[PDB]
């Protein structure tokens, strides 16, 4: 796959790793909708609002299968470690008007 998943479960915002590249989610938006990172970086989304959100990459984007991330409650977080350069678009499953991308370069 083009990204690995350190934790299939969401985890607490306080449990975010040093060195992770954080994208906050608030006001029904990914606060960094176009994030540029390097191969090997871990991106961590942190939900800062009451409304639950996830990240969802359709099949073929991060690998053969779709990656439908777990729903994050407020102050929960979720990581992906990107292993291959490319452009990886995602959306929020319940809120598909929320769109973002990670550009690994
Ligand atoms: Cu959402
Ligand atoms: Na909101």
UniProtKB/Swiss-Prot annotation:
Cu cation binds at residues 53, 92, 95, 98. The keyword Metal-binding applies. Binds 1 copper ion per subunit. Residues 1-105 form the Plastocyanin-like domain. It is found in: Periplasm. Its main location: periplasm. Keywords: Copper, Electron transport, Metal-binding, Periplasm, Signal, Transport. The keyword Transport applies. Its cofactor is Cu cation. GO terms for molecular function: copper ion binding; electron transfer activity. Primary acceptor of electrons from methylamine dehydrogenase. Passes those electrons on either a soluble cytochrome c or to pseudoazurin. This is Amicyanin.
């Amino acid at each position: 796959d083009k990204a690995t998943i350190p934790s299939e479960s969401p985890f607490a915002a306080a449990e975010v790793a040093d060195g992770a590249i954080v994208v906050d989610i608030a006001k029904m938006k990914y606060e960094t909708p176009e994030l540029h990172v390097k191969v090997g970086d871990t991106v961590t989304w942190i939900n800062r609002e009451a409304m639950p959100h996830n990240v969802h990459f359709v099949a073929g984007v991060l690998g053969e299968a779709a990656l439908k991330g777990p729903m994050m409650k407020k102050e929960q977080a979720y990581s992906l470690t990107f292993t291959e350069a490319g452009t990886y678009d995602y959306h929020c499953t319940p809120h598909p008007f929320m769109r973002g991308k990670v550009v690994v370069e």
